[PDB]
C-alpha cells in the first residue's frame, strides 16, 4: 500500500498511538546479559536501554570489552550502522577506541551537549585547533582540523591518532544542531538535507567501516536517521518502490537494537521524511 495513502489514512483516523503500540508489541526481545553485569553499571547512561548480546560491538581489549553500542546490518539495502548512546565521562576513551577499531569514517551526532537544562552527553571532541585531547586509558589523540558552521548543522574535520602505532585517520563529525528540545521538527527538509550531506561525504559507503550514529540514548533520533536512509535506498533499488513497508523495515532494525523510534510523533516524522524524500527524488 503506497505509504503516502497509508499516511493520510492514519492522520485522518488519528491512530498514530495505535500503530506505534502495535510495533512495540511485535518487536524482538533478545538477551542483554553483558550490559547488566555489575562491572558495567557506569558504562550505561540509561538502565532501560541496553545492546543485545548477539549484535553488541566488542572493544578489542582483554580487561573489559563492553560498550553500549549495536551493529545494525541491513542485508537487502547493503548498509550497516553502529548505533550508540552519547558518551559518558568515563566512556569517551572507549567511544574513540570503537571508531578506530571498526574503521569508521563518520560520526553522526543528533543532540546538543546540553538540552532542557541537563547534560545529554560528554564534550567528547576538541573545540579549538590548538587544544587537542588525549585519552590515556585507550592511547588515542584527537585534534580539531577545521569546522564549517551552517544554520541547521556543523561539519568538523578531526584527526584521530593511534599513539601506539603513530597511524592517523581523518574522521568527519556531522552535527545536527537544531532538533527542538520538545517534539519533532515541523518540516523534514533540513533533516533530509543533512542526510544527503552525510551520504555525499562517503561516510555511509561500503569502502569504510560502519558510520557511528548517536543521540542521548541512541534509539530515538538515531533510529529516525537509519530508518529514513534505509527506506529511501530500498526505493532506489527495487522494481516496485510502493513495496517498501516502513513498519516492516523498523521491525527488522529492532532485531539488532531495542526501542528504535521512541514516540508516535517520531514514527509520524519518519513517514514524512521518507515521503517528502520520495517526493524530491521523482
Ligand atoms: O532533502 C533532500 O532530498 C530528500 C532526500 C535526502 C537524502 C536521501 C534521499 C532523499 N536533498 C537536499 C538537496 C540536495 O539537492 C539533494 C536532496
Instruction: Estimate the global geometry from the Cα principal axes.
Output: globular
* Percent of residues in helices: 25-40%
* Biggest sheet strand line-up: 1-2-10-3-9-8-7-6
The largest β sheet comes out as: 8 strands, mixed
Query: What is the total number of structural domains?
Result: 1
The rounded Rg comes to 19 Å
User: Could you tell me the number of beta strands?
Assistant: 10
What is the tally of helical segments?
7
Strand content: 15-25%
Structural class, please? alpha/beta
Bound molecules: (phenylmethyl) 4-oxidanylpiperidine-1-carboxylate
Succession of helices and strands: HHEEHEEEEEEEHEHHH
**End-to-end distance, in Å?**
18 Å
Membrane topology: Peripheral membrane protein
Modified residues (S-nitrosocysteine): 215
Modified residues (Phosphoserine): 50, 242-243
Modified residues (Phosphotyrosine): 20, 66
Walk me through the structure.
It is globular and about 55 Å long. It has one domain. Helices cover 31% and strands 20% of the residues. Helix 5 (221-237) packs parallel to helix 7 (264-281). It has helices at 3-13, 16-26, 92-102, 189-200, 221-237, 246-253, 264-281; strands at 69-74, 79-84, 106-109, 114-115, 118-119, 133-135, 140-149, 153-162, 167-176, 211-214. It has an eight-stranded mixed β-sheet with strand order 1-2-10-3-9-8-7-6, with helices on both faces. It is an alpha/beta fold. The structure holds (phenylmethyl) 4-oxidanylpiperidine-1-carboxylate (B0G). (phenylmethyl) 4-oxidanylpiperidine-1-carboxylate binds at residues 192-193, 195-196, 232, 277, 280-281. The modification Cysteine sulfinic acid (-SO2H) is found at residue 215. Substrate binds at residues 181, 215-221, 262. GO terms for molecular function: cadherin binding; enzyme binding; ephrin receptor binding; insulin receptor binding; non-membrane spanning protein tyrosine phosphatase activity; protein kinase binding; protein phosphatase 2A binding; protein tyrosine phosphatase activity. Its EC number is 3.1.3.48. It comes from Homo sapiens (Human).
